[PDB]
């Protein structure tokens, strides 16, 4: 419909752990916006199974957030392997932004882009090789007029769709706070 090589592709994974070496992604959420960034569509939400020697290597922060958030249970109950969350996924990307032009977006990004490239090659192939990163513009706004900062604030429940829907808000709080176009 919209379908734009200026659309951009917003991810957020959550993970057993912070290395992509040992740990694996066990959630993964997935948003087109506009070049504007208006939400044009919203992509599969996918926990991913994992075993339980695998959930066994999450340390006590790890553990306690993603059992609160009801994750670890969806985790656990979870048909959907890596392979089928990168299908499902493509196959949503691919009705809105074309292979190999958006940067990967969201805050600290790298971090998603490690684990795509261990675990998930064949989507971190999809994106442009460029990152656009929200906390970017988070560090320098906080070295240059630190008091914007305090007029917005985040939920942080770690639910990987909440917390993109949350990088895209404050990504368009800063166009409005930071920017001047
Ligand atoms: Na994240």
Redesign the pocket.
């Given at each position: 419909m919209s379908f734009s090589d200026q659309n951009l592709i917003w991810i957020?994974?959550?993970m057993t752990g912070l290395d992509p070496e040992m740990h694996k992604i066990i959630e993964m959420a997935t948003i087109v916006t506009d070049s504007e960034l208006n939400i044009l569509a919203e992509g599969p939400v996918i926990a991913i199974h994992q075993p339980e020697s695998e959930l066994a290597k999450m340390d006590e922060w790890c553990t306690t957030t993603h059992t609160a958030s009801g994750l670890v249970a969806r985790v656990r109950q979870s048909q959907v392997s890596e392979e089928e969350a990168i299908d499902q996924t493509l196959a949503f990307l691919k009705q809105w932004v074309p292979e190999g032009k958006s940067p990967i977006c969201?805050?600290?990004?790298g971090?998603?882009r490690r684990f795509l490239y261990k675990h998930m090659p064949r989507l971190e192939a999809y994106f442009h090789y460029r990152y656009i990163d929200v906390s970017t513009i988070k560090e320098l706004t906080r070295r240059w007029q630190p008091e914007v900062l305090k007029e917005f604030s985040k939920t942080g429940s770690?639910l990987?769709l909440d917390?993109?829907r949350e990088?895209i808000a404050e990504l368009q709080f800063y166009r409005k706070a930071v920017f001047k176009i």
């Amino acid at each position: 419909m919209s379908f734009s090589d200026q659309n951009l592709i917003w991810i957020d994974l959550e993970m057993t752990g912070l290395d992509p070496e040992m740990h694996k992604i066990i959630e993964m959420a997935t948003i087109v916006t506009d070049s504007e960034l208006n939400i044009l569509a919203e992509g599969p939400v996918i926990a991913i199974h994992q075993p339980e020697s695998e959930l066994a290597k999450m340390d006590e922060w790890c553990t306690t957030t993603h059992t609160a958030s009801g994750l670890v249970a969806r985790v656990r109950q979870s048909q959907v392997s890596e392979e089928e969350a990168i299908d499902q996924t493509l196959a949503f990307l691919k009705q809105w932004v074309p292979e190999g032009k958006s940067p990967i977006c969201g805050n600290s990004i790298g971090q998603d882009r490690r684990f795509l490239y261990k675990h998930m090659p064949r989507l971190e192939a999809y994106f442009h090789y460029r990152y656009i990163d929200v906390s970017t513009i988070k560090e320098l706004t906080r070295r240059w007029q630190p008091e914007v900062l305090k007029e917005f604030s985040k939920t942080g429940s770690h639910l990987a769709l909440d917390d993109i829907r949350e990088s895209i808000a404050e990504l368009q709080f800063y166009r409005k706070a930071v920017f001047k176009i």
